Scaffold this active site. Structure first.
Site, PDB file in Angstrom:
ATOM      1  N   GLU A 242       0.805  -1.195   0.000  1.00 51.32           N
ATOM      2  CA  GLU A 242       0.000   0.000   0.000  1.00 51.32           C
ATOM      3  C   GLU A 242       0.830   1.232   0.000  1.00 51.32           C
ATOM      4  O   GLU A 242       2.008   1.176   0.285  1.00 51.32           O
ATOM      5  CB  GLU A 242      -0.922  -0.090   1.198  1.00 51.32           C
ATOM      6  CG  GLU A 242      -1.764  -1.368   1.126  1.00 51.32           C
ATOM      7  CD  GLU A 242      -2.907  -1.397   2.117  1.00 51.32           C
ATOM      8  OE1 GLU A 242      -2.842  -0.685   3.155  1.00 51.32           O
ATOM      9  OE2 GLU A 242      -3.862  -2.141   1.849  1.00 51.32           O
TER      10      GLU A 242
HETATM   11  C1  LIG Z   1      -6.071  -6.012   2.692  1.00 53.84           C
HETATM   12  C2  LIG Z   1      -6.214  -4.797   3.568  1.00 53.84           C
HETATM   13  O1  LIG Z   1      -7.354  -4.367   3.902  1.00 53.84           O
HETATM   14  N1  LIG Z   1      -5.044  -4.278   3.911  1.00 53.84           N
HETATM   15  C3  LIG Z   1      -4.887  -3.006   4.703  1.00 53.84           C
HETATM   16  C4  LIG Z   1      -4.871  -3.181   6.224  1.00 53.84           C
HETATM   17  O2  LIG Z   1      -3.522  -3.009   6.654  1.00 53.84           O
HETATM   18  C5  LIG Z   1      -5.750  -2.148   6.960  1.00 53.84           C
HETATM   19  O3  LIG Z   1      -5.879  -2.454   8.332  1.00 53.84           O
HETATM   20  C6  LIG Z   1      -4.960  -1.829   9.257  1.00 53.84           C
HETATM   21  O4  LIG Z   1      -3.701  -2.474   9.133  1.00 53.84           O
HETATM   22  C7  LIG Z   1      -2.667  -2.001  10.030  1.00 53.84           C
HETATM   23  C8  LIG Z   1      -1.363  -2.739   9.754  1.00 53.84           C
HETATM   24  O5  LIG Z   1      -1.140  -2.725   8.334  1.00 53.84           O
HETATM   25  C9  LIG Z   1      -3.098  -2.059  11.503  1.00 53.84           C
HETATM   26  O6  LIG Z   1      -2.172  -1.412  12.346  1.00 53.84           O
HETATM   27  C10 LIG Z   1      -4.445  -1.361  11.705  1.00 53.84           C
HETATM   28  O7  LIG Z   1      -4.877  -1.632  13.013  1.00 53.84           O
HETATM   29  C11 LIG Z   1      -5.466  -1.891  10.719  1.00 53.84           C
HETATM   30  N2  LIG Z   1      -6.693  -1.174  10.930  1.00 53.84           N
HETATM   31  C12 LIG Z   1      -7.871  -1.756  11.225  1.00 53.84           C
HETATM   32  C13 LIG Z   1      -9.086  -0.857  11.381  1.00 53.84           C
HETATM   33  O8  LIG Z   1      -7.998  -2.986  11.447  1.00 53.84           O
HETATM   34  C14 LIG Z   1      -7.140  -1.994   6.321  1.00 53.84           C
HETATM   35  C15 LIG Z   1      -7.938  -0.928   7.090  1.00 53.84           C
HETATM   36  O9  LIG Z   1      -9.266  -0.840   6.654  1.00 53.84           O
HETATM   37  O10 LIG Z   1      -7.100  -1.692   4.913  1.00 53.84           O
HETATM   38  C16 LIG Z   1      -5.859  -1.895   4.200  1.00 53.84           C
HETATM   39  O11 LIG Z   1      -5.184  -0.668   4.193  1.00 53.84           O
END
Ligand SMILES: CC(=O)N[C@@H]1[C@@H](O)[C@H](O[C@@H]2O[C@H](CO)[C@@H](O)[C@H](O)[C@H]2NC(C)=O)[C@@H](CO)O[C@H]1O
Ligand SMILES: CC(=O)N[C@@H]1[C@@H](O)[C@H](O[C@@H]2O[C@H](CO)[C@@H](O)[C@H](O)[C@H]2NC(C)=O)[C@@H](CO)O[C@H]1O
Ligand code: NA
Ligand code: NA
Lengths: 528, 528
Positions: free
Chosen positions: A131
């Protein structure tokens, strides 16, 4: 124990390698044991493989969070159980705020660590979940596919299909978008893509007769799902093609799992999928961030209680098995401009692959032709066939021309009796033809023995047989070096016998004067 | 005093309707009098027309900030001077965090207020500078172009060219992107577009042989400018076409004017523009946020001292005049899928305009044809010519088919001597053909007078002359209603004369037994 890959419809769920994540709405995502994951999640993605300690170097890895209270051995045991149930466990590479920055030549070490971890833990494949900056940092876009192709082939040689999936945020899937390189290089290697149709707010697409369809618009969610998927599975509307049998719809589990994108009314998804099935292109499944979220609590400490798998599990699993789209891929076909009379080769830049990744570039044929001796549009058709399918794609080649340019054609003043060469400092050129200075003629002459103004017309002839022509003009003024009486001034005072220059003549005052313009004082006035 | 429009190259500069703006790096943008704007800014955009007070309703307007210390009359006077110098003053609609939310039917009132303000203040046109949600909120995408077409025509009927420009953030310019509707509806009406190539961080594009080119990458700025512009001016790489004579490169004036996008080395721009000129497609100019920034101070209170106009003014103004691209526009041409044996009409959905906005849809012709009776790809070519140019664009029409579906074919148990109809609850259908229940045959029968298992094969015939075929199977089990002795259990105790059912027979115990399986005890054992 061994590589367990999925060939039916999938419901993919990410598993957090950490405890007690905070929700976008103040909820809480506990860590959970792998074995408590609902069976209908037949792909479970361990999140995340990343660089844990830049002391260890650039190559990401995976380290189990011990506070989940699974030993290494127990975690291996639980993967082993999921596998014994015919379910897949992937290692997800990346994550939100994961910093991966690989350089070219890193790919062998990345391939070796993926293999180590896979053989150690029993993983069945890898999900590319880069990302933000990680998508495009240093050479990730080359290293990652290069390592993964080596991993796929390492396991193919023991009869295993090491799974490769990706979770790109959807706006990165447009035609020259940031995830392009990953899709094109792993065309044939990847099992399916599960983009994220969440956290992109107002992003979306424009559809005629409907308008703008935003990923955050609840009133048009059905439209959002149908049209973005339709675009994806056909490669239309400015999206890369992902065949429908390899497209898995990625979603948040609930409102705490993501900022935006949650489907409030599951009917909007059932209906969208159904429409896709009605046009003969049913999707491969759904994906969710995340199983911990689906097993979490909201801000009021109420359990979400599996609401996501309740809404989608049965609906996805009760679909017919997927039917492989075996059409081949074409790559590099872009509309191109070609200069008049250049050499154009229709095959340069163009490649092709069959539905399994094999190069079939020499099987490509082209119909129609380009005459680079004549300006205009030429339309070509590329085709390649493999595995009893054909893919066709068109290409527009425009033949254009370019003006040459003159330089040095600027008005100038020279002194009486000097030498004057009309071509000194003048030249012309053209991008292709180069120097055209010999193609300039001059109409008119300058006589530097005779004061005055001389006009010169410069004509540049160019192109085929010099039948095109450009024209520019220039003024060359020949002045005397001889000085003469001072210019008359309205504000000055003169007296008898003062001389002045004015309107090309020399005049002599007859008496005291101020403000009287020479030539305006008649026969018997002050200026003579 | 009257409508002053620009027909040469432009250097556009936005003017703040407010004082002392804070910079992204802690600098300060003072308000300035219009008359102190550097003359080389030949388009100056008054920022911003918006909704000032939702008590006044939905239609935006313009109210001069009095703290700039210009009276209404003086501000009119200064516009008047710029006009007397042959310079244009536009009213810029929108702005970062401006909230415009128009509904359909608002367009007459929007057109009337634009005309009021134009005639009152002496503005020479309007810049569409909608951002964020304003681009796509309610019906802005219909109301705004509709009002502006009425404004353009109102002034065309008095011999004036009311200028229409736009400042879209560049990622909104992809092919089905959020600014699509504005460009397509105002094709022919707009004078030029000055997108913002700033504040988009890592966004950019992928170019073969170069890699990913981010708008925030200083090491590839030359590449960024060339390739994004090349894409724009040709409509390639997933961007809408904006002819080069109508493309103005929008930039920050300095690092305080914007978060990212500032060109550190102007040579990167000179070189890019030059390359564009070398392929015969020089750009129309540059734009900057903003003249107040270019006349501001940084965090150390050092004056920026006109550094932007110093770097670009002369370079842009010293270009040859623009040469109008008069090629016509085609619209609605998208690859489309068509069901086998449907009616396809190649002209439905397709429209065209000449370089001045005039509908020329009936002038469109199509080459090649689609046979919807045969599956496959068909390639068409659209063309339309106007003003001695032709535009051609290709289109891929894929003819596909769809499987029908069976329903009701599920294994079932019925009671001896009941009635059984093999077609009760069975049906078939197809999206096109509809009901195919009459097209189902049944191989095999069920005899409900005779206990056992009966297999039925259902064959569905469909399509042209019913020569396609789908097959499904079903098991119908006929059971007795007659009850009988209880099933033997390994864990139970029996005694002499107890009877049990086991492996289809009834057995009688000869003596006390537990754990002895009937049939396994021989000729003289406990079960007989
Ligand atoms: C496949 C996916 O959705 N990947 C991403 C996730 O990383 C992300 O969640 C967040 O990930 C972080 C570590 O990479 C965590 O620290 C954080 O807590 C976590 N957030 C939540 C709300 O669980 C999600 C978030 O919607 O989307 C992507 O960007
Ligand atoms: C054409 C253009 O650049 N338009 C936008 C501008 O509005 C924006 O500048 C910011 O505008 C606000 C009002 O809309 C001001 O309150 C704010 O002070 C101002 N910021 C600065 C640093 O001057 C610029 C910002 O780079 O970009 C567009 O988004
Ligand atoms: Na495994
Ligand atoms: Na004016």
């Amino acid at each position: 124990g061994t590589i367990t890959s999925q060939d039916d419809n999938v419901v993919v769920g990410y598993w957090h390698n950490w405890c007690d994540g905070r929700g976008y709405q103040g909820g809480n995502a506990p860590c959970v044991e792998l074995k408590t994951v609902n069976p209908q999640y037949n792909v479970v993605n361990i999140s995340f493989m990343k660089v844990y300690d830049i002391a260890e170097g650039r190559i990401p890895t995976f380290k189990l969070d011990p506070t989940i209270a699974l030993s290494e051995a127990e975690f291996i045991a639980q993967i082993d159980t999921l596998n014994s149930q015919g379910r897949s466990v992937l290692i997800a590479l990346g994550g939100a705020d994961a910093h991966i920055e690989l350089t070219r030549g890193d790919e062998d070490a990345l391939a070796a660590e993926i293999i180590r971890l896979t053989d150690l833990y029993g993983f069945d494949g890898l999900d590319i979940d880069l990302e933000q900056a990680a998508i495009t940092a240093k050479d990730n876009q080359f290293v990652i596919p290069a390592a993964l192709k080596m991993v796929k082939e390492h396991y193919r040689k023991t009869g295993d299909n090491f799974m490769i999936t990706m979770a790109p945020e959807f706006p990165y899937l447009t035609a020259n978008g940031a995830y392009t390189p990953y899709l094109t290089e792993l065309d044939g290697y990847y099992d399916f893509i599960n983009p994220q149709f969440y956290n992109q707010g107002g992003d979306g697409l424009w559809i005629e007769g409907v308008g703008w369809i935003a990923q955050n618009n609840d009133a048009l969610k059905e439209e959002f799902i149908y049209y973005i998927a339709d675009s994806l599975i056909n490669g239309t509307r400015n999206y890369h093609k992902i065949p429908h049998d390899k497209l898995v719809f990625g979603l948040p589990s609930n409102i705490d799992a993501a900022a935006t994108g949650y489907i409030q009314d599951p009917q909007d998804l059932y209906k969208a999928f159904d429409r896709l099935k009605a046009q003969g292109q049913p999707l491969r499944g759904v994906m969710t961030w995340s199983v911990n979220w689906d097993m979490g609590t909201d801000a009021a400490n109420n359990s979400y209680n599996q609401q996501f798998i309740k809404d989608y599990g049965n609906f996805i699993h009760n679909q017919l098995p997927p039917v492989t789209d075996m059409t081949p891929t074409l790559s590099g076909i872009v509309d191109t401009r070609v200069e008049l009379d250049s050499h154009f080769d229709p095959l340069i830049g163009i490649t092709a692959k069959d539905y399994q990744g094999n190069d079939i570039t020499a099987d490509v044929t082209v119909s129609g032709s380009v005459n680079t001796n004549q300006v205009g549009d030429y339309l070509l058709t590329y085709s390649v066939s493999s595995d009893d399918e054909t893919t066709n794609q068109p290409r527009k080649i425009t033949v254009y021309e370019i003006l040459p340019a003159f330089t040095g054609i600027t008005d100038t003043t020279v002194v009486i009796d000097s030498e004057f060469d009309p071509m000194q400092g003048v030249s012309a050129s053209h991008p292709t033809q180069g120097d055209l200075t010999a193609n300039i003629t001059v109409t008119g002459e300058v006589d530097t023995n005779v004061v005055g103004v001389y006009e010169l017309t410069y004509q540049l002839f160019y192109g085929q047989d010099n039948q095109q022509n450009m024209t520019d003009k220039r003024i060359v003024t020949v002045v005397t070096d001889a000085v003469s009486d001072d210019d008359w001034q309205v504000g000055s005072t003169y007296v008898k016998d003062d001389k002045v220059t004015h309107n090309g003549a020399t005049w002599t005052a007859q008496w005291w004067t101020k403000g009287e313009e020479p030539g305006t004082t008649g026969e018997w006035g002050v200026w003579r």
